[model samples]
Target: SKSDQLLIVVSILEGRHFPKRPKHMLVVEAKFDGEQLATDPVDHTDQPEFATELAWEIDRKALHQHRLQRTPIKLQCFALDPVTSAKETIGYIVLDLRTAQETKQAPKWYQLLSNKYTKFKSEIQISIALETD
Candidate 1:
């Protein structure tokens, strides 16, 4: 019987001197294992403080398979430029459920980075937890 649920919470904090701003929104996307689950385009705002929550119900067999394959859950955050309709890679981070499932930690602020590993003024905070009923 495979029936498990996971809850993901994402918080988009303030942007500090974002290179392109005044009409920008944070584009947040999430992936489970290797499958894209959600893409949320938050409202445009100079001072971004958006909160998004997502739930994933997984079959025990699939979850077991993911653990065996060591698949990672990833989240990518991009800055949407309304002027040109271009999205800049703000920062991205990966979360391994193997570790998260074992130990839960308090959510903390994470700095956004470019593809070249350069830090940006943008920062996002995240919290992850597993819920079972």
Candidate 2:
């Protein structure tokens, strides 16, 4: 059967600073404020204190690049540690406004950004692990 799958690609520091040890790949999940599907950040294997910091950085970068015309939408994403077989609770990558806007328009964007943002939110799960394939 054919089912929908999500493939998230993120670029990080090259050489020795990458998340995986050249053998492992970092898995993550995305998160957002309350229940809104707009303006969230991508969270990964960052520590609690550092998580917020990283989130801000991701948010800032997303806003800057997207030129959202407004506050820009925020979404939540989490990372999952690499495993032999797929696990069900690792988490996912948050899809921000920049990427989201590509498919949705401003009005639908407005509706998403409204107070009910989180209401009709969407989520994506990683079915394939990213590697040098």
Candidate 3:
């Protein structure tokens, strides 16, 4: 049984109108300090991502300290060139992690910050959950 710790889940979910030329291999990733969670690479498919769930556990006190300072959770979705064999970032959403602790498990829609297109802007849905004992 897990104890004296905080367990958090960052769901990678799916993207809406994310970047692609014709097709590409994409993966959604997230990280804290000790561990990182990532979804399997999938082509221009649909919602729920390749694999949409990941969990992290940390010392409760340290987790609280991190929240007090407002640490950010990075939604890094990268696309790999299947045609050119190059790696590039398609979009990202830098979400404030404190909301995870506040709402705890309520899924919130976060938009992707574009580094490529203007009117073709996109976003992904993310949810966070915490378990403390």
Candidate 4:
């Protein structure tokens, strides 16, 4: 008695070229359907990226509607200033899962775009899959 339902898996992994180059702690947050999760804070030199192994699920019916409307999930990046104790959004990667089914290939790197800082540049790694689970 299995109902018709399909779930697409979106994996949010590492990133590179974050703004300010980790002047403070950095984080990556994946937000969808009002639910969001973030990676562990990483602040260091000799490395300009954060390593994460996070996964998110999307319902087929809901995904289809968003796909048709051409809406991509925004993977937000934040810079945590310890002194200020604030999490300010620096940029985000526009993740388009609509084409995951069509290409069946995962895009390892996606560019990060910032609205407040147009000159800023960064990117995050992501992969979308059709999981039977």
Candidate 5:
């Protein structure tokens, strides 16, 4: 079982009304265990749709331990200001592996929260899948 691997896949569907101009590009960053897995960039819009995916692999045994501990995986979305070249956090979502294991991998749209802990009308659709091999 320790030799087995688990795959975690994340899809960043879309974003809207972030603190950026229409000419900017919004980038999505997915991180786990202090490691950045993938970054996707999409054109800025009132409603930006990206259907982009990022995936990570973990040891199944270790993931099982993390599940029991309710370890959180964070997906942070950001906006790249084309003029200033500065990155602004658009919003983020935290996923608990325990819940993901119980939900049988149901995918849904999650609200992205601002740094001030405020809710934004902007949301991103994501799906998570765990595979063992």
Candidate 6:
């Protein structure tokens, strides 16, 4: 279901911003859906599945950097709707993946664990039903 949700979100973005943008910007929210998954910005394509793969890749990269730096860094999390977003926060993590890697476990969990952490802060929300004026 995590992957499926990712697929839906990325698909929407693909429809809206491919070819023209070349590199489409994604605002991802990392969450535990009884497991874990990431959602990308601009959905409407077959890319969300691929986007999930990308999300893992980026996380690995961030962990690598954090290992060398020996410091805690901010990570991002996103959800499809505001309700889910609020539930996905993981709290503070040391950003230490090396030890976690050695132990074969997640180093530290981030409160917000997404790629584009700041870009979509305000954009992520719940849409309320409205009557036409």
Q: Give the TM-score of candidate 1.
A: 0.64
Taking the tens digit of each residue's C-alpha lDDT, what string does model 1 give over 1-133?
A: 3235434333333434334455776777778745575456665454455566555666656666766787766777777776788986666767655544523557666665563225445555666655553
TM-score of each: 0.64, 0.20, 0.79, 0.69, 0.79, 0.23
Error of 4 at 130 (Å): 2.9
What ordering of candidates by TM-score runs from best to worst?
5, 3, 4, 1, 6, 2
Clashes of each: 1, 28, 0, 0, 0, 18
lDDT of 5 by residue, 1-133 (tens): 6448667666566665444456788777777777786565677776777778676778877788878887777988777777888987867788767644512355687878664325447777777767554
lDDT (CA) per prediction? 0.58, 0.27, 0.69, 0.64, 0.70, 0.28
Instruction: Flag clash pairs in model 3.
Output: none
Per-residue lDDT of model 4, residues 1-133, tens digit only: 1233555556665555544544687777877666777777778332345656555556667767877887766678777876787888877777665666723465587777763446644566677766543
In model 5, pairs of residues that clash are none
Regions of model 3 farther than 4 Å from truth? 45-51, 83-85, 101-104
Model 6 root-mean-square deviation: 17.4
lDDT accuracy of residue 126 in candidate 5: 72
Candidate 1 runs further than 4 Å off: 2-20, 43-47, 64-69, 82-85, 101-105, 115-121
What residue pairs are clashing in model 1?
A: 2-60
The residue-by-residue lDDT of candidate 2 on 21-48, one tens digit each, is 2323332322333323221223232221
lDDT of 3 by residue, 25-80 (tens): 77777777746678877775444255477777777777778788777777677777
The prediction achieving the highest lDDT against the true structure is 5
Model 3, 89: alpha-carbon shift in Å? 0.9
Evaluation by lDDT, superior candidate among 3 and 6:
3
Candidate 4 wrong stretches, greater than 4 Å: 1-7, 19-23, 44-47, 82-84, 102-104, 115-120
Clashing pairs in 4: none
